[PDB]
Design an enzyme around this catalytic site. Structure first.
Site, PDB file in Angstrom:
ATOM      1  CG  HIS A 140      16.013  44.939 -16.465  1.00 14.26           C
ATOM      2  ND1 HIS A 140      15.650  45.367 -17.738  1.00 14.26           N
ATOM      3  CD2 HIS A 140      15.032  44.074 -16.091  1.00 14.26           C
ATOM      4  CE1 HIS A 140      14.504  44.807 -18.103  1.00 14.26           C
ATOM      5  NE2 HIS A 140      14.118  44.023 -17.117  1.00 14.26           N
ATOM      6  CE  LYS A 155      15.393  40.988 -13.959  1.00 14.34           C
ATOM      7  NZ  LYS A 155      14.631  39.974 -13.188  1.00 14.34           N
ATOM      8  CD  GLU A 174       9.919  45.791 -15.795  1.00  7.71           C
ATOM      9  OE1 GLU A 174      10.667  44.921 -16.280  1.00  7.71           O
ATOM     10  OE2 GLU A 174       9.065  45.577 -14.913  1.00  7.71           O
TER      11      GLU A 174
HETATM   12  N1  NDP Z   1      11.087  42.166 -13.592  1.00  8.64           N
HETATM   13  C1  NDP Z   1      11.616  41.503 -14.618  1.00  8.64           C
HETATM   14  O1  NDP Z   1      12.243  42.061 -15.519  1.00  8.64           O
HETATM   15  C2  NDP Z   1      11.428  39.984 -14.616  1.00  8.64           C
HETATM   16  C3  NDP Z   1      11.220  39.253 -13.449  1.00  8.64           C
HETATM   17  N2  NDP Z   1      11.178  37.842 -13.508  1.00  8.64           N
HETATM   18  C4  NDP Z   1      10.577  37.010 -12.411  1.00  8.64           C
HETATM   19  O2  NDP Z   1      11.383  35.934 -11.889  1.00  8.64           O
HETATM   20  C5  NDP Z   1      10.465  35.035 -11.224  1.00  8.64           C
HETATM   21  C6  NDP Z   1      10.926  33.569 -11.044  1.00  8.64           C
HETATM   22  O3  NDP Z   1      10.262  32.815  -9.993  1.00  8.64           O
HETATM   23  P1  NDP Z   1       9.007  31.779 -10.206  1.00  8.64           P
HETATM   24  O4  NDP Z   1       9.480  30.792 -11.200  1.00  8.64           O
HETATM   25  O5  NDP Z   1       7.739  32.499 -10.496  1.00  8.64           O
HETATM   26  O6  NDP Z   1       8.862  31.019  -8.784  1.00  8.64           O
HETATM   27  P2  NDP Z   1       8.099  31.253  -7.370  1.00  8.64           P
HETATM   28  O7  NDP Z   1       8.718  32.418  -6.702  1.00  8.64           O
HETATM   29  O8  NDP Z   1       6.641  31.205  -7.543  1.00  8.64           O
HETATM   30  O9  NDP Z   1       8.502  29.955  -6.502  1.00  8.64           O
HETATM   31  C7  NDP Z   1       7.983  28.674  -6.859  1.00  8.64           C
HETATM   32  C8  NDP Z   1       9.170  27.845  -7.353  1.00  8.64           C
HETATM   33  O10 NDP Z   1      10.252  27.903  -6.403  1.00  8.64           O
HETATM   34  C9  NDP Z   1      10.187  26.705  -5.581  1.00  8.64           C
HETATM   35  N3  NDP Z   1      10.165  26.976  -4.128  1.00  8.64           N
HETATM   36  C10 NDP Z   1       9.266  27.722  -3.466  1.00  8.64           C
HETATM   37  N4  NDP Z   1       9.512  27.766  -2.152  1.00  8.64           N
HETATM   38  C11 NDP Z   1      10.598  27.005  -2.033  1.00  8.64           C
HETATM   39  C12 NDP Z   1      11.146  26.658  -0.818  1.00  8.64           C
HETATM   40  N5  NDP Z   1      10.681  27.150   0.313  1.00  8.64           N
HETATM   41  N6  NDP Z   1      12.179  25.768  -0.861  1.00  8.64           N
HETATM   42  C13 NDP Z   1      12.608  25.277  -2.016  1.00  8.64           C
HETATM   43  N7  NDP Z   1      12.054  25.617  -3.193  1.00  8.64           N
HETATM   44  C14 NDP Z   1      11.024  26.486  -3.231  1.00  8.64           C
HETATM   45  C15 NDP Z   1       8.932  25.977  -6.009  1.00  8.64           C
HETATM   46  O11 NDP Z   1       9.050  24.565  -5.892  1.00  8.64           O
HETATM   47  P3  NDP Z   1       7.712  23.808  -5.370  1.00  8.64           P
HETATM   48  O12 NDP Z   1       6.784  23.941  -6.509  1.00  8.64           O
HETATM   49  O13 NDP Z   1       8.256  22.453  -5.121  1.00  8.64           O
HETATM   50  O14 NDP Z   1       7.340  24.586  -4.170  1.00  8.64           O
HETATM   51  C16 NDP Z   1       8.790  26.396  -7.460  1.00  8.64           C
HETATM   52  O15 NDP Z   1       9.728  25.652  -8.246  1.00  8.64           O
HETATM   53  C17 NDP Z   1       9.117  35.169 -11.952  1.00  8.64           C
HETATM   54  O16 NDP Z   1       8.059  35.551 -11.068  1.00  8.64           O
HETATM   55  C18 NDP Z   1       9.335  36.305 -12.953  1.00  8.64           C
HETATM   56  O17 NDP Z   1       8.235  37.207 -13.025  1.00  8.64           O
HETATM   57  C19 NDP Z   1      11.375  37.216 -14.743  1.00  8.64           C
HETATM   58  C20 NDP Z   1      11.547  37.928 -15.913  1.00  8.64           C
HETATM   59  C21 NDP Z   1      11.567  39.326 -15.838  1.00  8.64           C
END
Ligand code: NDP
Ligand code: NDP
Lengths: 473, 473
Positions: free
Chosen positions: B186, B183, B190
């Protein structure tokens, strides 16, 4: 009470520092873990000097005048820690341990902190110069717990190398890992300088078809100009050296460049803390590339080069172009190195004196040069200079070189001579001079596929996400 | 027993993966730490689907069919660990946790090992594609404990993106951190692709003086050639996009490129394990450079560029030269990326299937391209290929491009357009093709000032130290 300082670690580096120390009228007590070594040294190299030996860590501790001052010039890593563990029960609060090994700046910070609460003052010092330097005047870069400094100042500055106006190439660098961080940036820069020299060598060898005899002469001419340095000087010697059989030795040597790791760290640090130290990066990687020797042999059998156009032009001129291209690129990685130093300073809270550091690299160390003098009075005239390229000397020197520099690189590129470091220095130079860069397109892409938001050129601060996906669908 | 799998983490990415999962006829039980979020989703986006919610970690565990399969799509770092701590007391030996967050390959290894002895099968998976991908078919890269694979194979490959012959862009990568290491490589790649696109943009903008309208058209033409990719396609869209006011939006965006860290790691890994991944290095650093916006503003006021020679030549030809230069450089960083993958494989004992990985990046992920297809059948025809540049397609494609490539770079260099990535790719190319490199001079210097020893070209193995210092003194 009798010995002024102790040194543990009797390989050539420890050996020579003790003799250097003794010559400046300091009684030194030697010790090493293969204790037999202590005898061997006392009867041989140190015979007839004032250096005492110890056969137990405990009697070494006994010989010392308080505050006990002991130096570790032991293999970096575990070894240093073992010794600290053993040393701490014997020492009194207020005693001093110096680690002179090429240690990890982080290990130094840890150790410095750790020893503070046990009342032991720790200093991590960078030592440069090799055996020769160790013997007559090394470059020394002490950092750690500033309370140790007045107790060791006299010794370190006394054995340190001296610049023409008699100042020592040694002064207090800063807190905890500072001395050890400066030592490794020095090595980063060292890697850089070497690769630049190789590139110049490669162009005069393949584009100009010069024999090693003329190439040595050209380097020797260059050592009389701004390029005056230890490295250009030894390079002229290496090119002239003839083996037993009468032919030049350098063409016989295998082109896989080793590396003991310090250069690697400089570039990893720049990556961790977001500093574009691109030339040292390319230099480390050029060593990695040369290790794939068998692979390059296999690749040479099938990857085709450019069309062979013979060089037509004045060799004397192109030779001068290569000189100026080396010089401008060297200015560039030094600007990249001192901006890494500035960022680290900002990260860890060090008050660095960059003119001070320039002076410490002015003699003793491998990168010593007249160049470092010019860097020292740039920071003297302005200690808060953000970047060396903005100082009028360098701004003028680069402006003055850029014609040759672009000529040298275009020729190399057409001829197929690999120039990692010449090309990054120019890329970075052109990158840094530009007020507006295509980085805004990265931002657009990042916002488009990943929603990451961006900010406008006017109104910095607000982050916008556009819906690009469809704007009328 | 009722739900097939659980997903914890209800930000857009988790949200969309659950809907995707549900559409392929899998009952999913949702959960999130801000439990209110579960309701909100159930009444809104997931209303009228088959997804169950849980309001306690314990009832989420209760809903699952054994082997319990739960996915963490939570912020990487501490968060993931907290959840593991809480999960392990409730689970039975043989249960499965998948961490889909962008985690550190090392944290994954640790966790994978740690959970093995408690009988819990852990898999760390890379997920790529963004919201869109998450919703209809992400690229998925699972690694960790291979015993989990048969229990999750159906779901992951079912929701995965599909390449034209219907194969999923998801298969088992390898042990512990493999999926998470793939990952991040990749993302490294990118970063690389994006900087290359910017460079091409910069040359047609400044050397050719093209307006954004023509530049979009040229990219759109390029997307019909070998360069056919998602990134070239969205770049043509971005260049065409007009703001509310009728003028192009891209010129309004501030040129400081952010970075969430993954690209940084690829280049740090290459440095740690000695692999010349120079293009991704330059790409990360080009982002670091753009962050010094105010500094470049100040530098633009005083660092001088080359003499202004207007471009004279056929724009159509140079446009074609830029195309081929982008293409050859792209081939180069992909060769650098898969050699990093090979070295990591050697370091950690992974049996990687590089054609498999090529297929996983063929759809779903941001770097998706026809190009990856050509990489896949290079490794199909020869799975033990040491380097992509030795495969006849790439060897032919690069040979075919190099004239244009050297022309493009010489023009850029004379015009003053920064080309970090175009120049490293060529440097590396010329570096790798050469059987004999000036690295032997580094060795001579290292032996001279530091006694480090060297070996001869014939008789590799023996290390010699010459006494250069004086040979007749
Ligand atoms: N570069 C690439 O090729 C790609 C990268 N990615 C990336 O992967 C990422 C996935 O993360 P994303 O979904 O944005 O989430 P975030 O990093 O914004 O975190 C928020 C999520 O994680 C939970 N969370 C946050 N803090 C905690 C904590 N301290 N304890 C427990 N749970 C926690 C939140 O729950 P709550 O709301 O309850 O806080 C919410 O569900 C994306 O940003 C995406 O861009 C994806 C595709 C491609
Ligand atoms: N890049 C630059 O600018 C420069 C770098 N440097 C480098 O600094 C280096 C200094 O180290 P060097 O003197 O060569 O020593 P080594 O790394 O070879 O280590 C051997 C010494 O450390 C001791 N030692 C080894 N292992 C242990 C252990 N496990 N426990 C306790 N003690 C141990 C040895 O004692 P025993 O014999 O009892 O095992 C001996 O005294 C030099 O290699 C030099 O090149 C110096 C100048 C410049």
């Amino acid at each position: 009470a009798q010995a002024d300082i102790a040194l543990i670690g009797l390989a050539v580096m420890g050996q020579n520092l003790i003799l250097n120390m003794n010559d400046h009228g300091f009684v030194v007590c030697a010790f090493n873990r293969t204790v037999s070594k202590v005898d061997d040294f006392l009867a041989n190299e140190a015979k007839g000097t004032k250096v005492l030996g110890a056969h137990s860590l405990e009697e070494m501790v006994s010989k010392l005048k308080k505050p006990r001052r002991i130096i570790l010039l032991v293999k970096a890593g575990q070894a240093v820690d073992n010794f600290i563990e053993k040393l701490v029960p014997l020492l009194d609060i207020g005693d001093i341990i110096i680690d002179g090994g090429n240690s990890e700046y982080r290990d130094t910070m840890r150790r410095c902190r750790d020893l503070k609460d046990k009342g032991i003052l720790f200093v991590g010092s960078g030592v440069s110069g090799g055996e020769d330097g160790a013997r007559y005047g090394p470059s020394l870069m002490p950092g750690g717990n500033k309370e140790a400094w007045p107790h060791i100042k006299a010794i370190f500055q006394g054995i340190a190398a001296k610049v023409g106006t008699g100042e020592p190439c040694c002064d207090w660098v800063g807190d905890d890992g500072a001395g050890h961080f400066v030592k490794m940036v020095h090595n980063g820069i060292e890697y850089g300088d070497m690769q630049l020299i190789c590139e110049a060598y490669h162009l005069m060898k393949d584009v100009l078809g010069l024999g090693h005899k003329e190439m040595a002469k050209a380097f020797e001419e260059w050592n009389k100009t701004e390029l005056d340095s230890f490295l250009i000087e030894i390079t002229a010697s290496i090119l002239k050296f003839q083996d037993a059989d009468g032919k030049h030795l350098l063409p016989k040597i295998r082109d896989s460049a080793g590396q003991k790791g310090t250069g690697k760290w400089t570039a990893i640090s720049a990556l961790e803390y977001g500093v574009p130290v691109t030339l040292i990066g390319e230099a480390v990687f050029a060593r990695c590339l040369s290790s794939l020797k068998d692979e390059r042999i296999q690749a040479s059998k099938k990857l085709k080069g450019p069309q062979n156009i013979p060089f037509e032009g004045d060799k004397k001129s192109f030779l001068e172009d290569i000189r100026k291209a080396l010089y401008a690129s060297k200015i560039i990685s030094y600007a990249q190195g001192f901006m890494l130093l500035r960022q680290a300073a900002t990260e860890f809270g060090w008050t660095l004196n960059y003119g001070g550091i320039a002076l410490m690299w002015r003699g003793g160390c491998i990168i010593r040069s007249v160049f470092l003098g010019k860097i020292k009075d740039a920071f003297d005239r302005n200690p808060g200079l953000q970047n060396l390229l903005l100082d009028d000397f360098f701004k003028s020197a680069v402006e003055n070189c850029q014609d040759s520099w672009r000529r040298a690189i275009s020729t190399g590129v057409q001829a197929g001579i690999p120039m990692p470091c010449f090309t990054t220095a120019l890329s970075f130079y052109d990158g840094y001079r530009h007020a507006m860069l295509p980085a805004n397109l990265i931002q657009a892409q990042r916002d488009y596929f990943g929603a990451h938001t961006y900010e406008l050129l006017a109104k910095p601060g607000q982050f916008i996400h556009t819906n690009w996906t469809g704007h009328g669908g």
